Amino acid sequence: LQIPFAMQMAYRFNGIGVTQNVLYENQKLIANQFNSAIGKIQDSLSSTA
Amino acid sequence: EGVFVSNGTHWFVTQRNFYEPQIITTDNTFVSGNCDVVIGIVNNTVYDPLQPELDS
Numbered sequence A: 001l002q003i004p005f006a007m008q009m010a011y012r013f014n015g016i017g018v019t020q021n022v023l024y025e026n027q028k029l030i031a032n033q034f035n036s037a038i039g040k041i042q043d044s045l046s047s048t049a
Numbered sequence B: 001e002g003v004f005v006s007n008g009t010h011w012f013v014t015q016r017n018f019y020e021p022q023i024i025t026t027d028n029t030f031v032s033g034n035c036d037v038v039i040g041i042v043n044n045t046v047y048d049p050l051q052p053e054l055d056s
């Protein structure tokens, strides 16, 4: 079933006892922390085998 | 609980796993802040169940 990704992430936050509005009020921060955390994976794997 | 959906003219809340459309009210929704922060918020009436009582 298709669903917008920022609505999937609100359901996923609601599953850890954190109220949905926490995502929508912080979506920029949460997206930047995610994109930055993915960036560290490439640096980690590139840094050492 | 559940999600907002529209049939193209009206907005309903409904549960995530079985389509059962309900009127959007202050009972089935909770508030937080003003319109300005949220990406993709939309405008609709939210019904107040107390108003028929305040009509008395």
Ligand SMILES: *[C@@H]1O[C@H](CO)[C@@H](O[C@@H]2O[C@H](CO)[C@@H](O)[C@H](O)[C@H]2NC(C)=O)[C@H](O)[C@H]1NC(C)=O
Pocket: B007, B008, B009, B010
């Ligand atoms: C979206 O849902 C609403 C409510 O079911 C539909 O509006 C009703 O339509 C019937 C039949 O035309 C009328 O008898 C009711 O009086 C209408 N109610 C209201 C509140 O307007 C609406 O037609 C649906 N939209 C579409 C595109 O099907």
Ligand SMILES: *[C@@H]1O[C@H](CO)[C@@H](O[C@@H]2O[C@H](CO)[C@@H](O)[C@H](O)[C@H]2NC(C)=O)[C@H](O)[C@H]1NC(C)=O
Pocket: B041, B042, B043
């Ligand atoms: C939701 O509705 C409000 C009014 O109820 C809209 O606010 C107006 O928007 C225009 C354009 O930005 C401004 O010129 C008016 O001064 C606003 N009025 C108020 C009272 O703030 C708002 O644009 C609507 N939002 C959407 C997404 O349609």
Ligand SMILES: *[C@@H]1O[C@H](CO)[C@@H](O)[C@H](O)[C@H]1NC(C)=O
Pocket: B039, B040, B041
């Ligand atoms: C949704 O995507 C369209 C482009 O397909 C864009 O014009 C619109 O502004 C977007 N709305 C939101 C809430 O992101």
